Amino acid sequence: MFLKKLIEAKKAYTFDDVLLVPNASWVEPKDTDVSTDLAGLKLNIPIVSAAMDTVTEKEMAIALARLGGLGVIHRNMSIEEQVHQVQAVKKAGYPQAARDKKGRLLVAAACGPHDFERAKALIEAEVDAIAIDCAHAHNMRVVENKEMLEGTIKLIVGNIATKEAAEDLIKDVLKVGIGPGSICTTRVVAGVGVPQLTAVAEVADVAKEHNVPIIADGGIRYSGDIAKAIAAGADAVMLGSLLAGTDEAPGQLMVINGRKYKQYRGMGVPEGVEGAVPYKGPVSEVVFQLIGGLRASMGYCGAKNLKEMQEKARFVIITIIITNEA
Amino acid sequence: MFLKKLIEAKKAYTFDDVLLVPNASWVEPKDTDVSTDLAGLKLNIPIVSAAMDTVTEKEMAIALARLGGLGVIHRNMSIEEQVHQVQAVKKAGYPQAARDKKGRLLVAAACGPHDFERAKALIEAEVDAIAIDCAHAHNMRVVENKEMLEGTIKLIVGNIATKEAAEDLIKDVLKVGIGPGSICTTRVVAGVGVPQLTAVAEVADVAKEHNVPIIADGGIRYSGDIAKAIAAGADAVMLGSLLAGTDEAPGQLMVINGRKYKQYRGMGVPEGVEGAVPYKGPVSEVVFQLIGGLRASMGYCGAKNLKEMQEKARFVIITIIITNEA
Amino acid sequence: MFLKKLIEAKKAYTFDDVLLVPNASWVEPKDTDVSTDLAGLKLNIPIVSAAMDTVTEKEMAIALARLGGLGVIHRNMSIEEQVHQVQAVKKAGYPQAARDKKGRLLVAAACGPHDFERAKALIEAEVDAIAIDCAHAHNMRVVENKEMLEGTIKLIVGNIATKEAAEDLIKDVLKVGIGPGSICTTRVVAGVGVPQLTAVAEVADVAKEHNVPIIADGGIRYSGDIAKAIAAGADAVMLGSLLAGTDEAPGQLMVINGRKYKQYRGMGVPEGVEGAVPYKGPVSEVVFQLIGGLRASMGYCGAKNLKEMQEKARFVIITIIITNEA
Amino acid sequence: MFLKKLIEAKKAYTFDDVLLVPNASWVEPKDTDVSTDLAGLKLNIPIVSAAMDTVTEKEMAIALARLGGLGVIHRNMSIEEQVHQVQAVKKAGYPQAARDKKGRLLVAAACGPHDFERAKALIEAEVDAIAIDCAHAHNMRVVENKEMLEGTIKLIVGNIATKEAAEDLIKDVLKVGIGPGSICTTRVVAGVGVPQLTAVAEVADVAKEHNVPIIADGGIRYSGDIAKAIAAGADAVMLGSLLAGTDEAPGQLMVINGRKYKQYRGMGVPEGVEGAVPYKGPVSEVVFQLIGGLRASMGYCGAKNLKEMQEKARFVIITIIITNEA
């Protein structure tokens, strides 16, 4: 019973466990296609704002949608205010923009799994996606809940990290993230988690069979991790901290030892810490590096688009003064 | 002979080796039941004071019994004094209290494995549990001890970490702890130990078959470790350091770099160091966080009580400036 | 598909993963032969300059060729200038010198995989080797690439880290290095790499069957790593950082906390950082230590030459104030 | 060939890889017998001085022989002087003393594997053991070695770390130590080594079959490591650094930040660094702690003597402010 748990417990993998092995390549990074199609939503880069009151309000959602990415407007706010922030994006030269059929920068919003009133006004606020957004979407009341899909345009649900959780959310997009957060403390606090490669891998072997997109939430520290996230079955990454500290991040100007910062903190005992991160200036750059690394990665793998990166990328398992690392 | 030891030595696990994988859940943390029944002793939280002259005298035993937990009054003292401290708890609105059939806050006491005189006065001091308390309870004289069970109400024995040690203590409660102590130095000093998950797992596959409770002693650094301790067959955790530094801890006020501390040290060449830990204020909180994490964990696992947490919890094996982590 | 990548991903090894196990030995280090024959090029020590504008221009190539080693003159410069630097070595008591059939210190030069004009002037500049030198030589245009072998004397190609990449470069010498660089950031930046023992091992099981030499590029931090590099199928090591900071290194005098330095940086989003390393004085020593360690290693393995070191060396896998470590 | 080395390389273990699992015990530490019989030499504690010019001259050899242990008088000195130091011990209430049949404190001396003249005067200096003492005793000239056993009383040979090396030294005592030294740099310098448990295990499965004692040389940082050393087939430990810094150590008084030190350095490119270690005062204590830990360990294992510790000890494999850790 108890020893069987340990004798037979399988081994799970994160980003720093693996490396991508380079294949023969007909592709150069200039020639890549990083577009991804989250259930009809057509992104031109595979990046999604983490719906945190430190990461994504209107400025982010506009800037990132403009870039081909997707803002999830957070739900630590009034409906009057959320709806206002949805229609601010809809009411905003930008060549690789992500846009609804009405030309408008597309956007999404976070809704909690018992909040039906917010989900309505959202729909009327012409939101492109609703994110049923909680800590344990495999809570069986959350699964029930169907009722938000009777309400509807596209329904993203999370977070989950299991084969079984993905089966039960039948039901438009899934996100995976139980533990991965940089400022998340779920593992410390409740002993609970799955290393994010194994999590995304397992969840995607279910989800692929129904052409259900995976967004892979938390633990993305580098461009390389994004290339791993996708090689294991992600269709996009949900970035937050790497996008915290930028100008468009709604986090609070801070100073310590004279240097600029902006806060970054958790949503919810808490399962998320309060902190600060370096001021980064305009998100654009931050995105154009991440994408720039994913292309170079795509070139190493001989992948001209994210589909081929999913079908070709293979893993192997692994165990001076610096002056300008840029 | 010698190479066979290494070729065939099995691999053992601690807390930082595993994570709990979340299941489908009908349960929320508010709905949880963390009660545990240590051989008729009915605790309303699965927490046990470590019998150390830095951790548990009367103030702790009262406060923790009040909380649903259980004080083991330490044996680094005279019998006259131990017996006085037993009856102080018996002679002390507190809704989730752990209480003997006479309404009184229940309590326990540590007795060494050759001290028959102390074990008697204890019985007459109306103690609810005796802890036959030593470094190696699988010492075959200790096993002999029978004689303290002829003396008797409930008999807790420890510490042990093997299948075989559990067989020989047939015999009311077992505790496991050979190595785990934070300030314990058994591994350094005598090369000896078993990682505490494997220890509890193995010991519990014996003990479950006789409905013998496991208390899991040492190495609990976080609430998450408690949820792991139980998922591997613990019925309660024995906390000490995490409860050191609190107000009710009988350890000594200290200062270094202006900040408050209280000492924490080992019982007994020594197999335990002298140290200090931050002043924490009233134990209550410290307990209500640990329990708060165990509930959130129980909610992740779909466990409404500690039984289901034992039957459902599964493991997987694994390899920014902060401003308020509370 | 995705979980299969992780379930079945093999495990790869670097230098700090292994140790060489000592065999019975008829050999002492004085009696060793560290010569290596890179496709007719006859080196008297198995060391190759890394073609970096911080590591190898004329002074290095002369000094190292004199030592029995081989300078690759870098390609971050004009052809007029590269050709001048080739013929400077040709136009330069030195007992274990590496020398072309015309008595002259032999040398090599880096050429990019689309630069046909540079490859020509090179040939006319009487260069002994051309290094088709890029980040991903398994780019299928690079393989095409043939055309530089129709141009020709000896053709070194790199970098590659796979069985399959080695097959396609049929095809005179191979070098392996995808990730290993100290100041390389390929793994961070594009998630891509192979631990250098596995890389060299795999590449050499192909290359040996056609008597194709391996140069093993990057990650050499100690003399011991060189002995491992060769035991896994290298025929030489390509050193750079360990040779940076020396007098003959064309890197820039620097100071920080009063101590001498010279810069060291990457060739090419970038996949290489800017940095500095301690001033070392004349390369000779640096080389005579590395070689000195490789001999002591060769003596431990019972290997009188690099062939026997390849055929005998076996691995095992592994998991005070200092005042003069020399 | 090359990939086969890595695919099939076995995994080797050091001290920090394992823990000893406690068995049922009829034994208390007071009741233990730590005597060991190195080929007729009868030690009353299993400790051997490392023959280093920083560790063992006359003062050590007397003090340690008095304790039941064995001094190897080092060979970084003239024969006139070595012989003088042998007969100083012979020419020196001490209840557990190690003593030759003539009542005299027994002792040993280091001799290099080509130095026949030193080995003679030694014999005439009435030395109890000769240590054929080099870096690679599996050098096939060393094996030849025979000639020093024709010279003879007891012959200790080292260092070796392989099954095969032990076969060839047929054959009076073996010591194992290729890599383990704290100040040894063999792994760095020549890439060569075997983790010391696997080394001792393997060497002892040969040596036991001929009743050939193992001394286990280097890497002993704690009392616990000694208990592991023996459980894997050692018959004694060869201590050096842990015995450096003591009063009887012939190393040089030093100071840094006001605190007392004595140097400690290597014998012999070098394969040993120069350093210093804290002043410890009289060796006795240092020994009575190590032994004190080995007894507590022996008590945990149910071993009344070193034989039973070899036959019972089993391994498992593994992955606050301090004020007085004594």
Lookup: tokens for A28: 């150069």
Lookup: tokens for A101: 């059929």
Q: What are phi and psi of B64, to 5 degrees?
A: -75, -40
Q: Give domain status of residue A236, yes or no.
A: yes
* DSSP string computed for B18-33: EEEEP--BS--GGG-B
- B136 contacts D223? CB cut-off 8 A: no
Q: What are phi and psi of D246, to 5 degrees?
A: -65, 165
CA–CA dist B32, B38 (Å, integer): 19
Eight-state DSSP code of residue D137: T
- Please list the active-site residues of C: 184
Contacts of C4 (CB under 8 A, 6+ apart): none
Report, in this order, helix, strand and coil percent for chain A, each rounded to 5: 35, 25, 40
Lookup: tokens for A7: 């004798």
Task: Check: CB of residue D261 under 8 Å from CB of residue D279.
Answer: yes
Q: What are phi and psi of A62, to 5 degrees?
A: -65, -60
- C189 contacts A301? CB cut-off 8 A: no
Q: Give domain status of residue C42, yes or no.
A: yes
Lookup: tokens for A133: 């957004």
Q: Give domain status of residue C325, yes or no.
A: no
How many H helices and E strands in chain D?
12, 16
Q: What number of residues does chain B have?
A: 326
Closest residue by Cα to residue B325 from A178, A242, A184, A191: A184
The residue written with tokens 């190495």 in the block is B219
CA–CA dist D105, D86 (Å, integer): 10
Task: Check: CB of residue A121 under 8 Å from CB of residue A127.
Answer: no
Task: Check: CB of residue B71 under 8 Å from CB of residue B129.
Answer: no
- Amino acid making up residue D247: D
Instruction: Compute how many other C-beta atoms are within 10 angstroms of the C-beta atom of residue D38.
Output: 24
Tell me the nearest-neighbour CA distance from D283 into chain B, angstroms. 16
CA–CA dist A216, A196 (Å, integer): 8
Instruction: Compute how many other C-beta atoms are within 10 angstroms of the C-beta atom of residue B107.
Output: 31
Contacts of B233 (CB under 8 A, 6+ apart): A1, A2, B200, B201, B203, B204, B205, B207, B208, B214, B310
- Closest CB from C223, C232, C321 relative to D5: C232
- A192 contacts B23? CB cut-off 8 A: no
Q: Nearest residue on chain B to A139, judged by CA atoms?
A: B25
Tell me the nearest-neighbour CA distance from D178 into chain C, angstroms. 9
Q: Give domain status of residue A324, yes or no.
A: no
CA–CA dist A86, A127 (Å, integer): 7
Lookup: tokens for A274: 């309060």
Instruction: Give yes or no for a cis peptide into D159 (omega within 30° of 0).
Output: yes
Tell me the nearest-neighbour CA distance from B134 into chain A, angstroms. 25
Maximum Cα interatomic distance, chain A, rounded to a whole number of Å: 63
Contacts of C254 (CB under 8 A, 6+ apart): C260, C261, C262, C263, C276
CA–CA dist B313, A319 (Å, integer): 28
Neighbors of chain B by Cβ distance (3+ pairs < 8 Å): A, D
Lookup: tokens for D293: 């830990």
Q: Give domain status of residue D322, yes or no.
A: no
- Amino acid making up residue A263: Q
CA–CA dist C185, C205 (Å, integer): 27
The residue written with tokens 């022989």 in the block is D65
- C265 annotated as ligand-binding: yes
Instruction: Compute how many other C-beta atoms are within 10 angstroms of the C-beta atom of residue D147.
Output: 9
Closest residue by Cα to residue C227 from C310, C318, C317, C162: C310
Q: What are phi and psi of C110, to 5 degrees?
A: -90, 135
* DSSP string computed for C76-144: SS-HHHHHHHHHHHHT---TT--B-TTSSBP-EEEE-TT-HHHHHHHHHTT-SEEEEE-S-TTBHHHH-
Q: What are phi and psi of C220, to 5 degrees?
A: -75, 100
Coil/strand/helix, residue A316? strand
- Amino acid making up residue B75: R
Contacts of D84 (CB under 8 A, 6+ apart): none
Report, in this order, helix, strand and coil percent for chain B, each rounded to 5: 35, 25, 40
Task: Check: CB of residue C285 under 8 Å from CB of residue C245.
Answer: no
In D, which residues are within 8 Å of C23 by CB distance? Answer: 138, 162, 164
Cβ neighbourhood burial of B36 (10 Å; 0-12, 13-18, 19+): buried
Crossing angle (nearest 10°) for helices C223-231 and C196-207: 40
Q: Cα separations (Å) of A241 from A192, A219, B320, C260?
A: 21, 9, 9, 38
Q: Nearest residue on chain B to A272, judged by CA atoms?
A: B325
Cβ neighbourhood burial of D205 (10 Å; 0-12, 13-18, 19+): middle
- D182 annotated as ligand-binding: yes
Compute chain C's Rg from CA coordinates: 19
Lookup: tokens for B283: 């134990």
Give the DSSP H/E element, type plus range, for residue D255. Answer: strand D253-256
- Amino acid making up residue D124: E
User: How many distinct structural domains can be found in chain D?
Assistant: 1
CA–CA dist A178, A159 (Å, integer): 6
CA–CA dist C32, C24 (Å, integer): 15
Phi-psi region of A233 (alpha: psi -120 to 50; beta: other; left: phi over 0): left
CA–CA dist C177, C184 (Å, integer): 10
CA–CA dist D75, D55 (Å, integer): 12
Q: Nearest residue on chain A to B290, judged by CA atoms?
A: A189
Closest residue by Cα to residue A82 from A94, A71, A93, A70: A71
Lookup: tokens for B136: 């190696």
CA–CA dist A125, A274 (Å, integer): 31
Report how far Cα C59 is from the mean position of its chain's Cα atoms: 18
The residue written with tokens 């540590």 in the block is B110
The residue written with tokens 């290393």 in the block is A195
- D255-280 per-residue burial string, b: 16 or more CB within 10 A, e: under 16: eeeeeebbbbbbbebbbbbbbbbebb
Q: Cα separations (Å) of C144 from B153, B326, C170, C223, D276?
A: 86, 60, 11, 36, 60
Q: Give domain status of residue B261, yes or no.
A: yes
- C69 annotated as ligand-binding: no
- D181 annotated as ligand-binding: yes
Task: Check: CB of residue D190 under 8 Å from CB of residue D271.
Answer: yes
In A, which residues are within 8 Å of C1 by CB distance? Answer: 204-205, 208, 233, 310
| Pairing assessment for the beta strands D274-278 and D259-265 based on DSSP bridges | antiparallel
Give the DSSP H/E element, type plus range, for residue D238. Answer: strand D236-239
Task: Check: CB of residue B109 under 8 Å from CB of residue B129.
Answer: yes
Lookup: tokens for A265: 């903190």
Cβ neighbourhood burial of A319 (10 Å; 0-12, 13-18, 19+): middle
Report how far Cα B99 is from the mean position of its chain's Cα atoms: 19
Task: Check: CB of residue B312 under 8 Å from CB of residue B304.
Answer: no
* DSSP string computed for B201-263: HHHHHHHGGGT--EEEES---SHHHHHHHHHTT-SEEEESGGGTTBSSS-PPEEEETTEEEEE
CA–CA dist A205, A227 (Å, integer): 18
Compute chain B's Rg from CA coordinates: 19
Lookup: tokens for B108: 């326990």
- Cα angle D23, D27, D32 (rounded to 5 degrees) comes to 120
* DSSP string computed for D37-92: EETTEEESS-EEE---TTT-SHHHHHHHHHHT-B-EE-SSS-HHHHHHHHHHHHT-
Domain CATH number, residue D206 = 3.20.20.70
- B240 annotated as ligand-binding: yes
Lookup: tokens for C213: 């030499």
Report how far Cα D167 is from the mean position of its chain's Cα atoms: 20
Q: Give domain status of residue A209, yes or no.
A: yes
- Closest CB from D165, D178, D195 relative to C318: D195
Closest residue by Cα to residue C282 from C242, C326, C247: C247
Cβ neighbourhood burial of C221 (10 Å; 0-12, 13-18, 19+): middle
Domain span at residue D302?
A: 1-317
* DSSP string computed for A190-208: HSB---HHHHHHHHHHHHG
Contacts of A137 (CB under 8 A, 6+ apart): A113, A143, A157, A158, A159, A160, A165, A169
- Amino acid making up residue B17: D
Give the DSSP H/E element, type plus range, for residue C207. Answer: helix C196-207
Lookup: tokens for C238: 């390509």
CA–CA dist B193, A18 (Å, integer): 32
Closest residue by Cα to residue C25 from C303, C234, C283: C303
Q: What are phi and psi of C98, to 5 degrees?
A: -95, 120
Within an 8 Å CB–CB cutoff, is residue C164 touching chain A? yes
Beta bridge partners of B37: B42
Eight-state DSSP code of residue C65: H
Task: Check: CB of residue D276 under 8 Å from CB of residue C321.
Answer: yes
- C21-60 per-residue burial string, b: 16 or more CB within 10 A, e: under 16: bbbbbebebeebbbebebeebebbbbbbbbbbbbbbbbbb
Closest residue by Cα to residue A224 from C192, D226, C309, C72: C192
- D265 annotated as ligand-binding: yes
Beta bridge partners of D259: D256
Maximum Cα interatomic distance, chain D, rounded to a whole number of Å: 63
Neighbors of chain D by Cβ distance (3+ pairs < 8 Å): B, C
* Window D:22-41, CB contacts with B under 8 Å: 22-26, 28
Contacts of A47 (CB under 8 A, 6+ apart): A64, A67, A68, A69, A70, A236, A237, A239, A287, A290, A291
Task: Check: CB of residue C44 under 8 Å from CB of residue C98.
Answer: yes
In D, which residues are within 8 Å of C200 by CB distance? Answer: 2
Cβ neighbourhood burial of B55 (10 Å; 0-12, 13-18, 19+): buried
- Cα angle D153, D156, D157 (rounded to 5 degrees) comes to 140
Contacts of C14 (CB under 8 A, 6+ apart): A318, A319, C195, C196, C197, C219
Within an 8 Å CB–CB cutoff, is residue D289 touching chain B? yes
Instruction: Give yes or no for a cis peptide into B159 (omega within 30° of 0).
Output: yes
CA–CA dist C69, C46 (Å, integer): 6
* DSSP string computed for C26-72: S--GGG-B--EEETTEEESS-EEE---TTT-SHHHHHHHHHHT-B-E
- D1 contacts C222? CB cut-off 8 A: no
**Elucidation technique:** X-ray
Report how far Cα C311 is from the mean position of its chain's Cα atoms: 21
Within an 8 Å CB–CB cutoff, is residue A14 touching chain C? no
Coil/strand/helix, residue D189? helix
- Closest CB from A191, A264, A269 relative to B227: A191
Coil/strand/helix, residue A139? strand
Sign of the alpha-carbon dihedral angle for A245, A218, A29, C164: positive
CA–CA dist A102, A4 (Å, integer): 56
Task: Check: CB of residue B151 under 8 Å from CB of residue B144.
Answer: no
Residue of D1, D2, D138 best to disrupt the C interface, most CBs of C under 10 A:
D2
- A198 contacts B19? CB cut-off 8 A: no
- D188 contacts C223? CB cut-off 8 A: yes
CA–CA dist B31, B36 (Å, integer): 16
Q: Give domain status of residue C118, yes or no.
A: yes
How many H helices and E strands in chain C?
12, 16
Give A102-107 contacts, CB < 8 A, sequence gap 24+: A105/A61, A105/A62, A105/A65, A105/A66, A106/A41, A106/A65, A106/A70, A107/A61, A107/A65, A107/A70, A107/A71, A107/A73
Sign of the alpha-carbon dihedral angle for D276, D282, D287, D288: negative
Give the DSSP H/E element, type plus range, for residue B275. Answer: strand B274-278
Q: Cα separations (Å) of C306 from C38, D44, D147?
A: 12, 48, 33
Give the DSSP H/E element, type plus range, for residue B295. Answer: helix B283-301
Give the DSSP H/E element, type plus range, for residue D109. Answer: strand D108-111
CA–CA dist C308, A123 (Å, integer): 74
- Closest CB from A9, A136, A188 relative to B300: A136
CA–CA dist D186, D273 (Å, integer): 11
Lookup: tokens for B107: 């309590």
CA–CA dist C240, C236 (Å, integer): 13
CA–CA dist C50, A193 (Å, integer): 44
- Amino acid making up residue C50: A
Maximum Cα interatomic distance, chain B, rounded to a whole number of Å: 63
* Window B:111-150, CB contacts with D under 8 Å: 136, 138-140, 143
- Closest CB from C3, C12, C139 relative to A25: C139
CA–CA dist B271, B277 (Å, integer): 19
